[PDB]
Design a protein around this ligand. Structure first.
Ligand SMILES: [Cl-]
Ligand SMILES: [Cl-]
Ligand SMILES: [Cl-]
Lengths: 149, 8, 150, 8
C-alpha cells in the first residue's frame, strides 16, 4: 500500500541507526541516534511524515509501540501506529537482509567519513539510487503518484 | 511538560 | 523549474538557524535547525536531501556556501551541480522572503506544542508540505518527478 | 583530516 512504512533499529559502533522502510518500494530514510528512546523515535516519525504521505507505521518493537511520546507523534502527524509482528514470516527475512546490505554499504564508505552519521547518509543515498529496472527512489515516487491520481 | 516532545 | 532543481534558504529564529531546501517547481520543503550555518552543516544537509530526492542542481543560499570546499565536496559526492543563487529573476527573491514569513507564521502557531524549536520546525514543514492551495506541495513534487521518470 | 565531512 502507498502509505505503509516499517521501522527498523540496528546497531553499529556503539550507536543506533533508526531506519524507516517504505515497504512496497524498499526506499529508506535513516538517522544515527545515541540510543533508541520514544522521544527520538517520535521526532524521527514527525520528520518522515512531513516528507512523505505516511498512513501507517509498523513499529520496530513493543517499547516504541507502547511509548506514549511515539503515540503522541503519530496522533499529531495523522499516522496509524501498528505493531510490527511478522504475520508474514518473509517480513523478518527482508528486514534482516536490508540491515546486512546497509551495513555492507556503510563499510564500503566508512573510510570517507569521520562521523558515522555521514557514512549512514551515504549508504541511504546508495541504497535508494541502486537500480535492480528501477531504483527504490524511482519506485516510491511512481507508487505514490499513481495513488494521487 | 505537556508538550508533544516532552509529555512530562 | 525542472524536476531536479532546489534552492537553499537560511533563516533565523530564537538565536538559532533554520536551513531550508525548497524544490523550486513545487514549493515542497525540507528543513533543519542548526546552531550556526557552517559549510560542514550545509554539506551534511545536502547529502541528506540528495539521498531522499533526485537532486540535480542546488542554488546555494549565499556566497560562503557557494565557496565552501566542504559544500563542494558533498555536491561532488552526491552528484549535484552546485550553482549560485543570484535572483536573475527578481520574482525568486520575493518568493523566498514570503516562504520564510509563512514558515515563521506556522512555527508561531505550533510553537507552544513543542519544548524544542526543532520539533516546531518539523511540524511547520509538515503543515507547509500538506497544505492544499488544488494540490499540496508534496503532491506536486511527486507528480513532477514521476512524470520525469516516465 | 581527509574526510568528506572533515576535509582537514
Ligand atoms: Cl549563522
Ligand atoms: Cl533518490
Ligand atoms: Cl506530504
Amino acid at each position: 500500500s502507498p502509505g505503509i512504512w516499517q521501522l527498523d533499529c540496528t546497531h553499529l559502533e556503539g550507536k543506533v541507526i533508526l531506519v524507516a522502510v517504505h515497504v512496497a518500494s524498499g526506499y529508506i530514510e535513516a538517522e544515527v541516534i545515541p540510543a533508541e528512546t520514544g522521544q527520538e523515535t517520535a521526532y524521527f516519525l514527525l520528520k518522515l511524515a512531513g516528507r512523505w504521505p505516511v498512513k501507517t507505521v509498523h513499529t520496530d518493537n513493543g517499547s516504541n509501540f507502547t511509548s506514549t511520546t511515539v503515540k503522541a507523534a503519530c496522533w499529531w502527524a495523522g499516522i496509524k501506529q501498528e505493531d510490527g509482528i511478522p504475520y508474514n514470516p518473509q517480513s523478518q527475512g527482508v528486514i534482516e537482509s536490508m540491515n546486512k546490505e546497509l551495513k555492507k554499504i556503510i563499510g564500503q564508505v566508512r573510510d570517507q567519513a569521520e562521523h558515522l552519521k555521514t557514512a549512514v547518509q551515504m549508504a541511504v543515498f546508495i541504497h535508494n539510487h541502486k537500480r535492480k529496472g528501477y531504483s527504490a527512489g524511482e519506485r516510491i515516487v511512481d507508487i505514490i503518484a499513481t495513488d494521487i491520481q | 511538560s505537556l508538550k508533544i516532545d516532552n509529555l512530562d
